[PDB]
RNA sequence: GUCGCAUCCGGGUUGGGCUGUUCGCCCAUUGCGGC
């Protein structure tokens, strides 16, 4: 039963999931690492194949829930992993397919809108921040891949439960308009400090790639806000900016007043 | 004054070795990659020993050398020396700076960060970039990844060279803090106080722990207050650099007119 | 998993760790194919 050779045909099929085209073709993707597998399961994703290395714990096998369990050697593990030093627990899950059509927001939502194409590592970090602050919705560009290994790793698995939706620009604009959601453009040259916006009644922050925001979006915004920069640096990391904006809104919703 | 073409030239291997912390210690030199970062190291007063120019360098780059040796690298030799998938066209070999807390004085209400056991150079660089944005008066790096790693330099966009950032032994951080009579505020996910409810308008030192294990218990006890940033989702903790930025900007908000919660 | 070819002392061509994972990262230390 053990799969020992990196050349075994099953290892070949599992390592091919590293490529987005194969993930699309098969409807499957790899989740590497015990914590990320736990989070994918707790999020309700369908585990198809559990992969266990030689150092897996007894409890790891109990995660399978009726999926096929494969025991791989270190050498077979190394061909599937995205890491120089592989995890001992990985899962092959079915790709989730979520549409914004159903989504209904409450009266004072906290929304992040990510415009443009961000690097996978930065995106994963943004989504962790969004999860921490309890964002009700994150919108990203139509072709964004939420199930790359960097997004999964840098999100610490937060990507699985987070309401994040890749959508066309017009679909995003329409959704926001139909919610009558105030748009707040975050830009280093914003006319107001970000503490001066009022986010107690619901906000959609607009954020560009580490890049910048498109002009028509900045102009449509009710307000453009800047994070003060007191040294020589001109800008902060996008994930950091996303966290600063979201936690500011949380502060106000916790009783804080606009500056 | 030399043109190097072979990636296997002896100089090139010497230069790529500077990516190892161990070679930087052995030699006393380090590599600064990227035109902006070289500008910042120069502006900060660091000694440039060797300027490296790639094929797409521009004429003004050569005038940065100020009497250092200037080496011309082909695209292939440049690839070996670069720490990047896509190499920069301007790089400098500088002498490692000598900085001590001996000559540091703080004003009445300084804003300080103490980083304990951080291991990811990208995290350190993002923190330094936030400290720069927020105007921190001092950053103590206690026993973590090395301050002059390529990713610290790159992710701080060179702010590492001008920021008042100092690597210290953990026990020296404790002594410097006691010496300065600075209130210590321990950031930890289980902290009893929401971070917005601390008053940071007086002197304050925020304490941040390691990515994996967090803050040691002894440091939590030293703190006057343990503060937490609320977590509302599935994640149990935030990234250490995001945490640092959130703390720095809450203090800035308060110092800019805002009231504690 | 296994098998050469190197190479270094027959014997070795490493251990670990990681809440940013990417020409992945960190820390002790002491290669290159094929199937
Ligand atoms: N100090 C700051 N104030 C406001 N938004 C900021 C910021 N630093 C970064 N951001 C946000 O982070 C994104 C990526 S950072 C790129 C900044 C770029 N020079 C620009 O002019 O936008 C930006 O699009 C912006 O939305
Ligand atoms: N929600 C939060 N509140 C306060 N500090 C936090 C935080 N998330 C991360 N940090 C900071 O980031 C550092 C690394 S996070 C380490 C997490 C570890 N599981 C633990 O229990 O601490 C922590 O030591 C702390 O200084």
TrEMBL record, chain A:
Enzyme Commission code: 2.1.1.-
Binding residues annotated for S-adenosyl-L-methionine, in chain numbering: 186, 208, 227, 229, 236
Gene3D superfamilies to which the protein is assigned, alphabetical: 3.30.1330.30, 3.40.1280.10
Binding annotation for S-adenosyl-L-homocysteine: 186, 208, 227, 229, 236
Alphabetical UniProt keywords: Methyltransferase, S-adenosyl-L-methionine, Transferase
GO BP annotations, alphabetical order: methylation; RNA processing
Domain RNA 2-O ribose methyltransferase substrate binding: residue ranges: 30-99
Domain of life: Bacteria
Keyword presence, Repressor: no
GO CC list: cytoplasm
Family label: Belongs to the class IV-like SAM-binding methyltransferase superfamily. RNA methyltransferase TrmH family.
PANTHER family xrefs: RRNA METHYLTRANSFERASE 3 (PTHR43191), RRNA METHYLTRANSFERASE 3, MITOCHONDRIAL (PTHR43191:SF2)
Protein name in the entry: 23S rRNA methyltransferase
Species assigned in the record: Thermus thermophilus (strain ATCC BAA-163 / DSM 7039 / HB27)
Lineage, highest ranks first: Bacteria, Thermotogati, Deinococcota, Deinococci, Thermales
Automatic annotation (TrEMBL), chain B:
Binding site for S-adenosyl-L-homocysteine: 187, 209, 229, 231, 238
Keyword S-adenosyl-L-methionine carried by entry: yes
SMART domains given in the database record: SpoU_sub_bind
Swiss-Prot/TrEMBL keywords: Methyltransferase, S-adenosyl-L-methionine, Transferase
GO process terms (BP): methylation; RNA processing
UniProt keyword Transferase, yes or no: yes
Family indicated by similarity: Belongs to the class IV-like SAM-binding methyltransferase superfamily. RNA methyltransferase TrmH family.
Organism: Thermus thermophilus (strain ATCC BAA-163 / DSM 7039 / HB27)
This protein's GO CC annotations: cytoplasm
Binding-site positions, S-adenosyl-L-methionine: 187, 209, 229, 231, 238
Molecular-function GO terms, alphabetical: RNA binding; RNA methyltransferase activity
SUPFAM superfamilies per the UniProt record, alphabetical: alpha/beta knot, L30e-like
Protein name as catalogued: 23S rRNA methyltransferase
Superkingdom per UniProt: Bacteria
């Amino acid at each position: 039963m053990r799969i020992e050779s990196p050349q075994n045909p099953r290892v070949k099929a599992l390592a091919a999931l590293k490529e987005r085209k194969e993930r699309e073709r098969t409807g499957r993707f790899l989740v590497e690492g015990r914590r990320e597998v736990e989070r994918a399961l707790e999020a309700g994703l369908s585990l198809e194949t559990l992969l266990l290395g030689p150092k897996a714990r007894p409890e790891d096998r109990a995660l399978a829930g009726g999926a096929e369990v494969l025991e791989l050697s270190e050498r077979a593990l190394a061909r599937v992993s995205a890491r120089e030093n592989p995890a001992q627990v990985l899962g092959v899950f079915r790709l989730p397919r979520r549409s914004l059509a159903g989504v209904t927001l409450g009266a004072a939502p906290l929304v992040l809108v990510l415009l443009g194409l961000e690097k996978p590592g930065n995106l994963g970090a943004i989504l962790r921040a969004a999860d921490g602050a309890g964002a009700d919705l994150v919108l990203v560009a139509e072709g964004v891949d939420l199930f790359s290994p960097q997004v999964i790793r840098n999100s610490t698995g937060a990507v699985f439960a987070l309401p994040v939706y890749p959508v066309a620009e017009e679909e995003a604009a329409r959704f926001l308009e139909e919610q009558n959601l105030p748009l707040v453009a975050a830009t280093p040259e914003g006319e107001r400090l970000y503490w001066e916006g009022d986010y107690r009644g619901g906000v959609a922050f607009l954020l560009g790639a580490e890049k910048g925001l498109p002009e028509a979006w900045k102009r449509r915004a009710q307000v453009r806000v800047r994070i003060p920069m007191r040294g020589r640096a001109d800008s902060l990391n996008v994930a950091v900016t996303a966290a600063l904006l979201l936690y500011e809104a949380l502060r106000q919703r916790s009783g804080g007043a606009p500056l």
